[PDB]
């Protein structure tokens, strides 16, 4: 199986500057007929991929000239000479020369913007939930950039790993920030045994970890 390694797997860029995705095959992708069947696809979220370049460097009809492809042997490049809003999505390279046909992992292109610190809120469980014998403690970490963030939970001063479910939004379309939801799920009995609940985030915007807490008496 030819492996296709794309790098980088993520690439922040500002509108109008110029991007390069490398894609490298684990073996020669010259077909016996002599042609090199290397291709590039763009997939926007919840859509089919869409063909951009084929046979290494040929643009598919409709594709702007800002896109261009190049390479040989086992080593190829896609270059976007001026990034535009409609170019953000995931880029795959593809090899059609050896069965089984194979794709690279993908390279996500995101809008760069300035560092934003998250707004963090913590919410104890609603009395409604309690009365059915569950307790979820929810933490929102909203509108931050960049995406690299670590949340950790403490119950009574002590780290807690199991029972946590985390969910991320995509890059917001208006302001280019990310958001995240962390939920600690406990049994009612379990929640009532402990008193301090902390939601703790580490993000580059702050030297200190950003902490929210509450005590079950309040």
């Amino acid at each position: 199986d030819i492996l296709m390694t794309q790098t980088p797997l993520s690439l922040p860029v500002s509108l109008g500057d110029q991007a390069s995705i490398s894609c490298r095959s684990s073996q020669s992708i010259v077909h016996s007929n002599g042609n090199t069947y290397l291709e590039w696809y763009l997939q926007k979220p919840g859509q089919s991929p869409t063909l951009l370049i084929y046979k290494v460097s040929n643009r598919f009809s409709g594709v702007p000239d800002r896109f261009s492809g190049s390479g040989s042997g086992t080593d190829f490049t896609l270059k976007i000479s001026r990034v535009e809003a409609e170019d953000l999505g995931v880029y795959y390279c593809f090899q059609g020369s050896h069965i089984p046909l194979t794709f690279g992992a993908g390279t996500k292109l995101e809008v760069k913007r300035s560092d934003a610190a998250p707004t963090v809120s913590i919410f104890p469980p609603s009395s409604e939930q309690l009365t059915s014998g569950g307790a979820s403690v929810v933490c929102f970490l909203n509108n931050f950039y960049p995406k690299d963030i670590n949340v950790k939970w403490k119950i009574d001063g002590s780290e807690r790993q199991n029972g946590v479910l985390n969910s991320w939004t995509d890059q917001d379309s208006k302001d280019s920030t990310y958001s995240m939801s962390s939920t600690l799920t406990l049994t009612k009995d379990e929640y009532e045994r402990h008193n301090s609940y902390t939601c703790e985030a580490t993000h580059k915007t702050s030297t200190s970890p950003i902490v929210k807490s509450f005590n079950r008496n309040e």
Partner: protein, 216 residues
């Protein structure tokens, strides 16, 4: 117009089997091959195999899972997947192909979910703050939608009226059921003073719930 049209989403139980169709129109069906591909979430694409009258080839890896068939007389192809487990949860695509033309037109994708869960309506809980918020000029409120099956659920706030400052987060699976949540940020001047209400519709179970967020 060249067009490939795939069948709707599928919800089946483990060990069951599913058939998906890809109907071609806008061109001479027997000139192009059809390839079937899979995309697991957050992952790349993998090639299942192609169907063409004259050639049916499988990726070695799928050759016990998949059976590809064509009906040239209605220019529609089928992929049959069997003994399904939830590791087969993916979006399945068909494209048109030749060595010389590449994957130029694609189907819209078909979603497959394999699960043993039965339809189960969400519980909706309101997330009001406990008082370190009262001081501030903006306040964040929440709605926790949990233990439902299957996707999707629609959440809105004040029937649609509040659209800015809303984040609704992707559902995660735990114990075979889904949980999702949604935040809204509103100026402290307008809450509790004015009403903020969370509206959840779960069409599969035919359920709508409205919960107003009230202080504790």
């Amino acid at each position: 117009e060249v067009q490939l049209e795939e069948s709707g989403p599928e919800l089946v139980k483990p060990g069951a089997s599913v058939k998906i169709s890809c109907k071609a129109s806008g061109y001479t069906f027997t000139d192009y091959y059809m390839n079937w591909l899979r995309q697991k979430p957050g992952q790349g694409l993998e090639w299942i195999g192609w169907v063409y009258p004259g050639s049916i080839k499988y990726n070695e890896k799928f050759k016990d899972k998949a059976t590809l068939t064509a009906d040239t007389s209605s220019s529609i192809v089928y992929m049959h997947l069997s003994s399904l487990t939830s590791d087969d949860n993916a979006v399945y695509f068909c494209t048109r192909w030749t060595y010389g033309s590449s994957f130029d037109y694609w189907g819209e994708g078909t979603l497959l979910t394999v699960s043993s869960a039965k339809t189960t309506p969400p519980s909706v809980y309101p997330l009001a703050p406990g008082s370190a918020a009262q001081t501030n000029s903006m306040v964040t409120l929440g709605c926790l939608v949990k233990g439902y099956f299957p996707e999707p659920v629609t959440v809105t706030w004040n029937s649609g009226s509040l659209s800015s400052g809303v984040h609704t987060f992707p559902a995660v699976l735990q114990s075979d059921l889904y949980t999702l949540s949604s935040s809204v940020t509103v100026p402290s001047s307008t809450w509790p003073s004015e009403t903020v209400t969370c509206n959840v519709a779960h069409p599969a179970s035919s359920t709508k719930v409205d919960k107003k967020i009230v202080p504790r």
